C-alpha cells in the first residue's frame, strides 16, 4: 500500500509543481527581455535627437 501510494500520488504531485514553477520563471524572464528591449530603443532615440 505504501509503495503504491508513493508511486501513484506523491510523485506526480511534485512533478506538476515543478512544471508550474518553471513556466512562471520563464514568463518573468521573457518580460525582463521585453523591458530591456524598450530601454535600449529609448536610449538609441535620445542620442539621435539632433542628428
Amino acid at each position: 500500500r505504501r509503495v503504491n501510494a508513493l508511486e501513484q500520488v506523491v510523485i506526480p504531485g511534485i512533478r506538476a509543481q515543478i512544471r508550474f514553477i518553471q513556466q512562471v520563471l520563464e514568463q518573468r524572464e521573457r518580460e525582463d527581455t521585453f523591458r530591456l528591449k524598450r530601454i535600449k530603443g529609448k536610449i538609441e532615440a535620445r542620442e539621435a535627437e539632433e542628428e
Binding site: E26, R30, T33, F34, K37
Partner: protein, 578 residues
C-alpha cells in the same frame, strides 16, 4: 558588382555606406582582409553586414564588395571522397597550403579546378533540352556521374564539345541563345530542388541492426529520429549506419561536434572497406565536419549544405542516406544566431520559428520521380540529445511531430550494458504495413506473420513484471516461467547486438529470420513438453539453449548449415524428453 566602404565597426556588426543596389541576404567580402558576411538590413544608402570571422584589426574606410549571390553550393563532379566544413570549404586542400591552423581570409574552391575529366556527350546539335535533363556522363570511381542541365535553363543546343579530357570550368554545351553550360552549377542551399512527382515508399532501408530493420523498420525515403541521454549509443549507431547500410551514397553531417570525437571519424574511415564492392568506404561518402570553435554561421547552415548535396545526388537516380549527428547542437547555433538578432524567445530560449526550420529540413526527404524521369530517394536519420534525458524538450517535441519512425534509447538499459539501448515499448514505426508486400517476396512468406508472434511474446513478458517484482521467479507456475525464460532468451540472443564484434556487427535479413524460427520452434516444443507433464528444470538444462546463444557469432555464409543442424537437433532433443 556593388562596392562601398566601412562606416562603423562594433563587434561582428559592420555598417557600410555607398551600397545602394545591394540585395538582401547576399554574401559580401568585408575589408582588405577578405572576411565574409551576410547583409541582414538595408537602410537608404547603407547596408548592415554581419561578419562571420573575428573583426579585430579592421579600420574605418576599407572597401566592402558584394558577390551578388546568397549562400550557395557548387554541385558537380568531384564531391565524393571529400571533407568539407559547414560552408563547403575543402579542409584537405586548406591544410596543404596553410598548415595546422586555419588562417582567416583563406580562399579555396569547392571543386578542383585543375583535374581532367573524361567527357562523353549524350546530345547532338539541334536537340531540345529542358531543365533537369542529361547532357553527358563522366566516370567517377565506381559510378558514372551524369552532367545535368540546371533546373531553370531551357533552349536548343548549338554546339557540343567532342569527347576528351576536360576540366570542370570548360564550357561543354553552348545553347543557341548564348548560354554556356559547364560541368557544374550553383544552387542556393535554402531552396528545395524541384521534382515531377513524389511517391509512396515501398522498399525497406536495411540498416544491419537486428532490432531496427525488424521491429521498427524505416522505408527508403522515410525519416527517423533517435533521441537519448548522454552515453546511450547515438554516435555508435550513426557510425554503424554509415558503415553497413545499403544506400548508394552516404552523406555524414556533424553539425557542431566534439573535436576529439570528430577525430575518430576523420581518422578511422579511410581504413575501412565498402560492404557492397569491397573498395574504399570513402569512395561513396561525403563528409561535412564542424567542431565547436568553427564560426556559428557555418554551424547553422551545415544541415542545409548536406541536404542540398543529397538532393543533387538524388536527381541522378541514386539512393542517398543522410546522417545528422546531434541536431541539438545545431539548435544551439540557431538559438545563438537568434539571440544576436535581438528576437523575443519562446519556450526555453529558442526562437519561435524553430519548428518551422525543423519541418523545412525533414520534409525534403522522400521517393520522387526526377525531372529526367528516373527514380530517386533521400532518407534522413537525425540524432537528438536532450539536456536531461527528458522528452518534453522543445526540440524533441518539434521533431516527433513530423518523423515517420521513432527509436527511443533508454538510460536504464545502458546502465546494464544492454546494447543497443532501444526501449521497445516507447518506440514505434509507421512503415510496417507498406513494407509487408516486399518482405513476403524477398525474405519468406511467413515473415510478417512470424514477427508479430515474437512481438506478442515480448508483450506477454511485460505484463508479468508486477508479479515477478513481488514474488521471485521460482514461485511461478511453469506456464509463465516458460515465457519468462523465452523472454530472457529473446532479449539476450536476438535483440542484443555488439557493434565492436567482427561478425556480430552486421546481420542480414535471412539470418535474423532463421534465429526467429529457431526461437519460436523452441517455444512450441517446450510448451508441448510442459503440457506432457515434465518439469521446467530439465528443459532449461538442454544443450540446445547454448546453440541459440551462439547464433549471433556464426559466420554469414556458415549460417545455412548451422540453422539446419540446430533445427534437426532441437526436434531430436525434445522428442527424447519424458
Amino acid at each position: 558588382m556593388i562596392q562601398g566602404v566601412i562606416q562603423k565597426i562594433a563587434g561582428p556588426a559592420v555598417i557600410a555606406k555607398g551600397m545602394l543596389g545591394a540585395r538582401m541576404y547576399d554574401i559580401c567580402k568585408v575589408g582588405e582582409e577578405g572576411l565574409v558576411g551576410e547583409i541582414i538590413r538595408l537602410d537608404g544608402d547603407t547596408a548592415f553586414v554581419q561578419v562571420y570571422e573575428d573583426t579585430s584589426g579592421l579600420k574605418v574606410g576599407e572597401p566592402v564588395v558584394s558577390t551578388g549571390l546568397p549562400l550557395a553550393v557548387e554541385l558537380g563532379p568531384g564531391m565524393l571522397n571529400g571533407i568539407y566544413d559547414g560552408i563547403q570549404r575543402p579542409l584537405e586542400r586548406i591544410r596543404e597550403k596553410t598548415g595546422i591552423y586555419i588562417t582567416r581570409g583563406v580562399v579555396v574552391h569547392a571543386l578542383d579546378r585543375e583535374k581532367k575529366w573524361a567527357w562523353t556527350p549524350m546530345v547532338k546539335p539541334g536537340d531540345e533540352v529542358r531543365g533537369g535533363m542529361v547532357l553527358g556522363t563522366v566516370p567517377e570511381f565506381g559510378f558514372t556521374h551524369k552532367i545535368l542541365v540546371p533546373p531553370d535553363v531551357r533552349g536548343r543546343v548549338k554546339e557540343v564539345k567532342p569527347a576528351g579530357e576536360y576540366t570542370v570550368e570548360e564550357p561543354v554545351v553552348v545553347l543557341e541563345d548564348g548560354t554556356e553550360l559547364k560541368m557544374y552549377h550553383t544552387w542556393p542551399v535554402r531552396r528545395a530542388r524541384p521534382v515531377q512527382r513524389k511517391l509512396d515508399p515501398n522498399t525497406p532501408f536495411l540498416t544491419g541492426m537486428r532490432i531496427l530493420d525488424v521491429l521498427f523498420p524505416v522505408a527508403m525515403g522515410g525519416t527517423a529520429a533517435i533521441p537519448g541521454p548522454f552515453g546511450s549509443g547515438k554516435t555508435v549507431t550513426q557510425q554503424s549506419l554509415a558503415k553497413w547500410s545499403n544506400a548508394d551514397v552516404v552523406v555524414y553531417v556533424g553539425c557542431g561536434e566534439r573535436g576529439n570525437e570528430m577525430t575518430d571519424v576523420l581518422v578511422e574511415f579511410p581504413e575501412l572497406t565498402d560492404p557492397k564492392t569491397g573498395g574504399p568506404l570513402m569512395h561513396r561518402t561525403v563528409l561535412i565536419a564542424n567542431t565547436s570553435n568553427m564560426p556559428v554561421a557555418a554551424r547553422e547552415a551545415s544541415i542545409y549544405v548536406g541536404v542540398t548535396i543529397a538532393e543533387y545526388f538524388r536527381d541522378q537516380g541514386f539512393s542517398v542516406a543522410l546522417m545528422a549527428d546531434s541536431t541539438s547542437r545545431w539548435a544551439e547555433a540557431l538559438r545563438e544566431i537568434s539571440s544576436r538578432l535581438e528576437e523575443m524567445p519562446a519556450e526555453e530560449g529558442y526562437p519561435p520559428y524553430l519548428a518551422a526550420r525543423l519541418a523545412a529540413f525533414y520534409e525534403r526527404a522522400g521517393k520522387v520521380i526526377t525531372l529526367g524521369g528516373e527514380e530517386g530517394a533521400v532518407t534522413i536519420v537525425g540524432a537528438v540529445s536532450p539536456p536531461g534525458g527528458d522528452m518534453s524538450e522543445p526540440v524533441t517535441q518539434s521533431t516527433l511531430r513530423i518523423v515517420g519512425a521513432f527509436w527511443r534509447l533508454d538510460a536504464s538499459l545502458a546502465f546494464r550494458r544492454h546494447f543497443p539501448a532501444i526501449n521497445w515499448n516507447g518506440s514505434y514505426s509507421l512503415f510496417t504495413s507498406a513494407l509487408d508486400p516486399w518482405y513476403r517476396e524477398n525474405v519468406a512468406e511467413d515473415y510478417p506473420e512470424l514477427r508479430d508472434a515474437i512481438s506478442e511474446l515480448l508483450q506477454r513478458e511485460a505484463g508479468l513484471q508486477e508479479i515477478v517484482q513481488l514474488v521471485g521467479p521460482d514461485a511461478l507456475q511453469d506456464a509463465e516461467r516458460l515465457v519468462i525464460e523465452v523472454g530472457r532468451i529473446i532479449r539476450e540472443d536476438f535483440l542484443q547486438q555488439n557493434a565492436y564484434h567482427e561478425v556480430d556487427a552486421y546481420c542480414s535479413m535471412k539470418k535474423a529470420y532463421g534465429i526467429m524460427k529457431m526461437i519460436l520452434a523452441f517455444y512450441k516444443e517446450a510448451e508441448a513438453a510442459i503440457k506432457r507433464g515434465v518439469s521446467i528444470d530439465e528443459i532449461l538444462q538442454l544443450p540446445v539453449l547454448e546453440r541459440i546463444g551462439r547464433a549471433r557469432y556464426v559466420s554469414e555464409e556458415e549460417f545455412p548449415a548451422y540453422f539446419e543442424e540446430a533445427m534437426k537437433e532441437i526436434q531430436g532433443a525434445f522428442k527424447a524428453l519424458a
